[PDB]
From a paper:
C. neoformans sterylglucosidase 1 (Sgl1), the first gene/protein identified with a sterylglucosidase activity, converts erg-glc to ergosterol and glucose. Sgl1 is an ideal pharmacological target with broad spectrum since Sgl1 is widely conserved in fungi and there is no obvious homolog in humans.
Hit 1 is a piperidine derivative with good solubility (clogP 1.49) and an IC50 of 1 µM in our primary screen with res-glp as the substrate. To aid future medicinal chemistry optimization, we determined co-crystal structures of Hit 1 and Hit 9 with C. neoformans Sgl1 at 2.8 and 2.3 Å resolutions, respectively. Strong electron density for Hit 1 and Hit 9 was observed in all four Sgl1 molecules in the asymmetric unit, which allowed unambiguous modeling. The overall position of Hit 1 and Hit 9 were notably similar to the predicted docked erg-glc-binding pose. Despite its lower potency in vitro and in cells, Hit 1 was chosen for animal experiments as it was predicted to have more optimal pharmacokinetic properties. In contrast, Hit 1 alone or in combination with fluconazole resulted in no CFU recovered from the brain.
Residue numbers in the entry: 4 to 598, 639 to 722, 778 to 830
């Protein structure tokens, strides 16, 4: 590709990564593959405040505090060098750095935590040390920690006129700190993945509608002279812009060589935007679990009125209706009273609320959606149209999300001129058509893909379903989407990943695709692998988890050959609480599963304790893959049982191929070492006991690095293959 940047026109650094085609590319044309992890989910909450501890939860945040120092990596006690060494030893060259809006602007509006940004820069320098490519993830989950997840600082809830201490009583949000109640919390009983249902409760339904479409559906909500939409978007964009600016100014050496780009706002909520009927819950809403009130039922609850709501259980094929429970807030209203807005809201944080922003009562009824006197729905399709143009049916992705991404993208490149725009469309949604006025030949599709069944049920079922195919109207009967057996289930999920790749070619353009999140739950079968059930039988047996991860990872192999960042790597993962967030346990490594410099790891002469101890199903996520390829990757296939690894490339006449430009393949010690015994390890070093058969050219192995030289075809294009296998089968 051109030595000049398609964004700037300026010449490119020798470590520039080209993202102008369907694949990442270096300056010498080699097609790059980026595989790593998300680091880390531990940075979603401050120090000494995991999701299940309510003590100190509100008091610190109301004090404007937010101690996120040493999360994800502790730079004080030297633990960071070990974790990074373990990730480089696993063949990973990518990191999705997680940070949240709360950790940057917790003190107050435009009161930024520069000490934490300096910490982030310090961690980013260490990842650069280790040769990791990083792209930043502005992370959030159901808006904020205080609405059940992570992301926004506490004052943003007050910014929308919401009383944070009336959330549980109105069912506007389920929090792990206050489940099933703030009076008698039992966070051990927190249902599986129920936190995600918060997107469909009143708090997230209100805030997200304010965020993306405040000026359209809540024009009466003025704060500091501007609508709540501009107030929340500008503050978040400015906060992320501050971190980008401090990186470019204080440590510009990190841009492009280490920090290659920036992701969009992680998994944004759609609020009530596009709701065709507030009286019902659409059948296309994939996720329903627990008490699931309809929008109007959630609004009536938000006004302190009792409702009898559908209860949903998650069966073997999606949610299904169960109980019908009565939620009785006993008059407690979600909405902040004006007196409390003076003491804790507007007057506490230093903004002025408009005259027509009615407090203490439901803001949507104030816009005529329903009448509080009769509790009768008035405008059921209010969120399906533009009030200013009711003939226009709204689409959340095209009409509102894309507008936000334009504002966000311009601020990123303002401080990171060579930033790659990692575009993360909303969950289970195709990306929109975006102008290349903004993209400028430097972008990557950044969708998330999870085996939804395995994630929601915390089991590796003998069955599975083509969820994407059902969404995209591929089947006359939904039973056609069901697959049974590993073979059919693996081939099916690999076909779902292929549809994510076709969304890039068809909508955005010839840009790479990178699965920003993928993974499997480790606390499967009631934490059986942790010895919690059946008298401890099955402890340390991660066979169920291994096949689940092998499926999702193989789904990115095959003809896809995708880039991805596994979710996640939580350095402080424990069996009792998982990743210390809403009962999820998706981390590859934990201290409870126990029992160094860059060049030393590259030579391969390290203890196998590093690549084995503390890991779970390491055979699944530590896979052989081509780091750089002369040509274009055609197909990747890996089999854990026999360690056989076939790789096919497409080589052309104009591909550059000499002895300093070669195909690089990573062969892990986890599968291909002569032995991983710590006994043998103290006396002898690790080395690849492999058999290589290449259809073309020359090979060479050092440590864990395989090099493959081959001459380009004289005419047209051809396919070269290479096949690696450990001598004698799998390491037993
Ligand atoms: C077959 O089902 C599918 C298919 C494609 C995509 C998805 C999801 N995309 C985002 C999801 C939820 N997110 C929230 C956070 C999470 O808990 C990690 O922290 C898990 C990921 S699912 C599910």
């Amino acid at each position: 590709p051109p030595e000049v940047s398609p964004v700037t026109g300026n010449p490119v650094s020798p470590h520039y990564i080209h993202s102008s085609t369907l694949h990442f590319q270096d300056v010498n044309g080699r097609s790059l593959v980026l595989r790593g992890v998300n680091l880390s989910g531990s940075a979603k909450h401050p120090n000494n405040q995991p999701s299940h501890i309510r003590e100190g939860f509100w008091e610190t945040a109301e004090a404007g505090k937010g101690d996120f120092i040493n999360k994800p990596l502790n730079l004080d006690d030297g633990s960071a060098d070990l974790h990074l060494a373990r990730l480089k030893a696993w063949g990973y060259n990518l990191l999705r750095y997680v940070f949240t809006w709360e950790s940057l602007e917790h003190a107050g509006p435009k009161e930024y935590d520069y000490a934490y940004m300096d910490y982030i820069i310090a961690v980013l320098r260490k990842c650069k040390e280790w040769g990791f490519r990083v792209f930043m993830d502005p992370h959030q989950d159901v808006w904020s920690r205080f609405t059940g997840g992570s992301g926004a600082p506490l004052w943003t809830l007050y910014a929308c006129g919401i009383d944070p201490y009336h959330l549980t009583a109105t069912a506007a949000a389920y929090l792990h700190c206050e489940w099933p109640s703030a009076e008698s919390p039992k966070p051990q009983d927190f249902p599986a993945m129920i936190w995600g249902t918060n997107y469909t409760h009143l708090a997230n339904q209100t805030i997200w509608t304010f965020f993306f479409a405040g000026k359209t559906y809540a024009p009466k909500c003025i704060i500091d002279g501007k609508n709540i939409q501009d107030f929340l978007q500008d503050h978040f964009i400015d906060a992320v812009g501050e971190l980008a600016k401090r990186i470019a100014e204080e440590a510009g050496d990190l841009l492009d060589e280490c920090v290659i780009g920036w992701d969009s706002i992680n998994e944004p909520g759609e609020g009530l935007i596009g709701c065709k009927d507030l009286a019902v819950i659409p059948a296309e809403q994939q996720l329903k679990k627990g008490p699931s009130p309809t929008p109007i039922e959630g609004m009536r609850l938000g006004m302190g009125e009792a409702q009898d709501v559908q209860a949903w259980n998650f069966g073997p094929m999606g949610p299904y209706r169960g109980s019908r429970q009565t939620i009785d807030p006993k008059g407690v209203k979600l909405w902040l009273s004006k007196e409390d807005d003076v003491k804790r809201g507007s007057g506490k944080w230093g903004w002025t609320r408009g005259k027509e922003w009615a407090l203490g009562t439901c803001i949507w009824a104030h816009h005529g959606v329903w009448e509080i006197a009769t509790s009768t729905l008035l405008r059921p399709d209010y969120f399906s149209t533009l009030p200013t143009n009711p003939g226009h049916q709204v689409d959340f992705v095209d009409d509102f999300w894309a507008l936000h991404w334009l504002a966000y993208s311009s601020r990123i490149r303002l401080h990171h001129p060579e930033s790659i725009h990692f575009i993360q469309a909303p969950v289970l949604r195709q990306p929109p058509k975006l102008p290349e006025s903004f993209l400028k030949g430097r972008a990557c599709s950044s969708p998330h893909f999870y085996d939804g069944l395995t994630l929601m049920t915390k089991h590796w079922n003998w069955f599975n379903a083509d969820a994407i195919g059902v969404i995209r109207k591929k089947y006359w009967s939904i039973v056609q989407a069901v697959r049974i057996g590993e073979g059919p289930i693996r081939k099916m999920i690999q076909g779902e990943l292929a549809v994510l790749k076709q969304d890039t070619i068809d909508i955005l353009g010839n840009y790479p695709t990178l699965v920003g999140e993928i993974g499997i739950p480790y606390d499967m079968d009631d934490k059986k692998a942790y010895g919690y059930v059946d008298g401890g039988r099955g402890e340390g047996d991660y066979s169920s988890q291994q096949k689940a991860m092998d499926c999702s990872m193989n789904a990115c192999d095959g003809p896809n050959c995708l880039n991805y960042a596994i979710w996640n790597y939580v350095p402080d993962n424990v069996h009792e609480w998982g990743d210390n967030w809403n009962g999820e346990d998706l981390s590859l490594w934990s201290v409870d599963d126990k029992e160094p410099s860059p060049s030393v790891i590259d030579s391969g002469d390290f203890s196998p304790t590093l690549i084995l101890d503390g890991s779970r199903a390491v055979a699944a996520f530590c896979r052989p893959y081509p780091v750089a390829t002369v040509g274009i990757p055609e197909r990747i296939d890996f089999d854990i049982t026999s360690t056989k690894f076939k790789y096919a490339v497409r080589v052309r006449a104009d591909d550059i191929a000499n002895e300093q430009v070669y195909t690089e393949i990573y062969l892990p010690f986890v599968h291909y070492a002569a032995s991983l015994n710590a006994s043998y390890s103290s006396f002898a070093q690790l080395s690849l006991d492999v058999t290589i058969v290449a259809s073309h050219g020359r090979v060479e192995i050092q440590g864990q690095t395989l090099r493959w030289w081959y001459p380009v075809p004289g005419t047209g294009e051809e396919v070269y293959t290479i096949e690696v296998q450990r001598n004698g089968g799998a390491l037993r």
